[PDB]
Amino acid sequence: PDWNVSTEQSIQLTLGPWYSNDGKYSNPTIPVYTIQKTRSDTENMVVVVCGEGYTKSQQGKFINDVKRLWQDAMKYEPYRSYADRFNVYALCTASESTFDNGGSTFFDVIVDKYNSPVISNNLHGSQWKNHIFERCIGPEFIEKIHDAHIKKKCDPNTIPSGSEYEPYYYVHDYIAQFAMVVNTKSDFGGAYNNREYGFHYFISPSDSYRASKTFAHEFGHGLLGLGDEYSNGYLLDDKELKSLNLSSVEDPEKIKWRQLLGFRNTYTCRNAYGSKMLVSSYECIMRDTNYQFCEVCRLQGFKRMSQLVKDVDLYVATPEVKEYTGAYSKPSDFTDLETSSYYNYTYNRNDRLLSGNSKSRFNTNMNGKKIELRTVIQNISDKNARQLKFKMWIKHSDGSVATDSSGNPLQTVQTFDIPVWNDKANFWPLGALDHIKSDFNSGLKSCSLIYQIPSDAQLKSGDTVAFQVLDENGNVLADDNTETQRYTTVSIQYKFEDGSEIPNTAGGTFTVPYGTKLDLTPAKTLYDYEFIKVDGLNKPIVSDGTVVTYYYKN
Ligand SMILES: [Zn+2]
């Protein structure tokens, strides 16, 4: 057949018998499409997506499939908070046969007896097939396309058996993640993280009934470093320190995530009846693909991604307001690790919740009652300690601050000190091959502000709890409208100054909070084109389908 995509930007590989023993892909041409390039590759996390089982005439489907899956992944926190700090490239790897036809494919993917997708070295006797990403595709991409333009060092068809891993370690520092999308409807998924031996890729299907959730799940194993919360077993020591989101420590005073206990749906429990593997929440995507990321996974994932960029200095989880009753306020309240205790906890939280979609639960019977504003804040600086001010007040329906019988406003303020992240260098820094141990509480502070509503509070129907989390300059980092905020879709398009579209680009779509002013320094180049101007930055995004246009010369 013929390519149904532009060939103007491409890379060429040389695959000898170790990577293509049958010769079917000895000298393949791989067209390169830019799904998103908001900044220089040196400042963003670079994601490279290749297609398995797409013929030359199916590359239009492959690009659209990558855009769909990537956009749906960017709707999950913590990815969403970094959506504009990814650069995404689609590499149109052509297979002779479609996957469903079962002939020759670019990556020799088979589905084993465990429904796992695996690059099969022994399918055609290509003994280094599953090293293709870090030894062939990666170095060619980093030399020709990546703004760093690192010249290839070692010949991938010549390197002798012995120290064949170290010369390719740099690949996974310039390319944050390799993703392989299989043109199929079968439901499978698998991540392969073993950087000491060069593996950092995952495989997911394009059209399964849960393709988008599977993509976000395997991306969390690969990029975020999260473990499966469905796994059995028993984390002994060393394994306890290694795991970001799993634990086997049963004393709530010693659990790594003690500071998060009682915050939203964080209640330690076993991942199954009679299991010694504990999770911080029974509703997380890393256990069941129908859920969102739990608070620990969001914290850990956010921290991991902060290592790969240089301009993120603080994590502020979405605060919550609850009636303070003393329930679930001390570590002893969390000693029961059964799933019954978790769901009883979530029911207690819902009964006391006064924020988000439960902001309406506030009523005039709240007089003389205590309310608690709570969130979790992670400092990203290993250098600068932070001080954040929490303000909370009772607000009437019309926006006025409620008062007591003396006319004193029902408001309270408390400043919290966020310590530095001293242990930062131990938490998947750029260049690490693995994670061994980290201090979960380094740079971490649970902040709780308890306010006693006076008994003489002049409450009216429709009153609500308002709050603000402010930084040292007074910027609002989160408020009582954050949880239910509307998000608007924004697209980045790439055009020449005359107005035509730049070939081999296909701008994707991500969401930002309504009213967001995008503040990004565009990359100086796009392929060999030089950046001129951008239309759409530094203005409030107030409509779905807003287009920001990057303009390039020639
Ligand atoms: Zn989780």
Numbering used by the authors: 323 to 876
From the paper:
Here, we investigate the substrate specificities of two enzymes of the M64 metallopeptidase family, the IgA protease ThomasA from Thomasclavelia ramosa and BF3526 from Bacteroides fragilis. In contrast, X-ray crystal structures of BF3526 in complex with substrate and product peptides, combined with enzymology assays, show that this enzyme targets the N-terminus of pre-digested proteins, but does not act on intact IgA. These findings reveal divergent substrate recognition strategies between M64 family members, while providing new structural insights into their conserved catalytic mechanism. Despite containing a metalloprotease domain with a putative zinc-binding motif, ThomasA shares little sequence homology with M26 proteases. This multidomain protein (~130 kDa) harbors a zinc-binding HEXXHXXXGXXD motif within its predicted catalytic domain, a hallmark of zinc-dependent metalloproteinases. Structural comparison of ThomasA323-878 and BF3526-STPP crystal structures revealed a conserved overall architecture of the M64 peptidase domain.
ThomasA323-878 comprises three distinct domains arranged from the N- to the C-terminus: an M64 peptidase domain (residues 323–632) and two β-sandwich domains (β1 domain: residues 633–807; β2 domain: residues 808–878). Although the crystals were grown in the presence of the decapeptide VPCPVPSTPP, which corresponds to a segment of the IgA1 HR, no density for the peptide was observed in the active site of the structure. The M64 peptidase domain adopts a seven-stranded β−sheet topology (β1–β2–β4–β3–β7–β9–β8), with β2 and β8 in an antiparallel arrangement. The active site, which extends longitudinally across the enzyme, is a large, solvent-accessible cavity flanked by β8, α3, loop 2, connecting loop α3–α4 (loop 4, residues 545–616) from the M64 domain and by a small segment of connecting loop β13–β14 (loop 7, residues 741–764) from the β1 domain. However, we did not observe electron density for the predicted catalytic Zn2+ that should be coordinated with two histidine residues (H539 and H543) from α3, along with D550 from a long connecting loop 4. A secondary Zn2+ binding site is located within the M64 peptidase domain, where it adopts a tetragonal coordination with E551 of loop 4 and three cysteine residues (C606, C616, C619) from loop 4 and α4. This secondary site is less solvent-exposed, suggesting a structural rather than a catalytic role. The β1 and β2 domains encapsulate the M64 peptidase domain on the side opposite the active site, burying 4714 and 2026 Å2 of the interface, respectively according to PISA analysis. The X-ray crystal structure of ThomasA323-878 reveals that β1 and β2 domains are positioned opposite to the active site, suggesting a structural role rather than direct involvement in substrate recognition or catalysis.
